[PDB]
Amino acid sequence: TKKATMIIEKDFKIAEIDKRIYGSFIEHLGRAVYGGIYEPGHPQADENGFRQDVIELVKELQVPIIRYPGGNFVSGYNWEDGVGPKEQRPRRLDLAWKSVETNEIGLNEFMDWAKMVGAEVNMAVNLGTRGIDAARNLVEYCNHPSGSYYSDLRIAHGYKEPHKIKTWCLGNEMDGPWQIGHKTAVEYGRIACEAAKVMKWVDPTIELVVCGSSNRNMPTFAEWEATVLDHTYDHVDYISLHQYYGNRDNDTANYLALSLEMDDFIRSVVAIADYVKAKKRSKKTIHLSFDEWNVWYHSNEADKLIEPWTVAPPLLEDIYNFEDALLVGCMLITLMKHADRVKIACLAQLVNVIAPIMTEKNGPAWKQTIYYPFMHASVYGRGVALHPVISSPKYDSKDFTDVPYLESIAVYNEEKEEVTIFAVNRDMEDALLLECDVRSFEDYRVIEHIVLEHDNVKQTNSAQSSPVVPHRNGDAQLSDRKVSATLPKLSWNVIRLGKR
């Protein structure tokens, strides 16, 4: 064993957590929609063709906001193609994913699905092949009550009450040479500025996300964000950032350190926002939408065998293992550590596509390994993120020095009189004996200690069996104003405290 200490001080706060950091994302990609949320033949389909089993699995994650309809897809998409009578909806070539899109689901049916899972929708506008006229028309269609052509058209399409969508994305990551209608930072900043203005003139209640770089390795990384914000600052509310991780080298110790990079990356994008704030002399603070994050790598070879121009190909179907769940847990803790400036985040994506929920045609829906830490973070991670002051043993890996074995944060919920400690032990060999100073939480007791662990980091779940599942046999105990807990080697831990 090794020892680590953490102070849990009520009055050393980061910020209230915005629940939208537990968001997700559904794109018209692979089986996320067709065979994912929507499967008319299925024994568990509802009156509208939505799979009830998927609905219950999303509800259990308590996802507050879902980005839709893309993603790379949106940059070539015409929103009118997906509304009104099905017979008039055209079949399209989706150039993003080289698929035929039938438009059998469009925005009004997605809104119906979102209402059944209790999520708001973070709606994206196309700024690839389209521009400012389509952006104002879509906001009017969705949000204007009545008495104009596009509002009355929504009513005629069967949706009397406006959708009242709060948060919109200005395009999708347009910086990449593989994007439909790629734009330079100046071209994107200009069209995003002019789109943002007309959107807000239709509905001043909305807020806007301007798109950051596709990834931190782009040649234009950081330059992009600074230029785009220079063009848009007065008209927008968030800047996005995106990250995927993978373990292509089978190096568990280096893999689990990657959240340290995520931490730096968030601090960098915050710095850019605050540079442009100062350059503008603005009183407004721009926050971050971490609107794509996950592990993604396992399905890369399988995707190469998919022929173009099929309907609902099985793209991006990673099957996650236990170490992947540990890294997801470290990523969630990293989001909470930045609750002051990361207000929205989207686990990319929610069903089938690099997803915590997987489905089988005419068959079961099941929870991936990564479902569990996400569920725990969403369910028990509402409240105020506290500033951690930690003394942990550390290790070096290929790409990282001084990696703490302990990754942890506490979240205080004053209304529930609860404190939740999220902790990963990265150690591949030894348990960590965690001692938490809880002097500032008088009359708190341990409620529970949840552990996600498995002897085999490569073990996956499947429709037939779930060997990687949480248990409640964690030994956390409160004695003399100190919580002592054994964190097993390679484990995710949720130590819940409450006033009793």
Ligand SMILES: *[C@@H]1[C@H](O)[C@@H](O)[C@H](CO)[C@H]1OS(=O)(=O)O
């Ligand atoms: C990020 C995009 O917005 C998505 O369409 C996609 C899958 O989540 C990601 O882009 S990438 O070009 O696949 O990395």
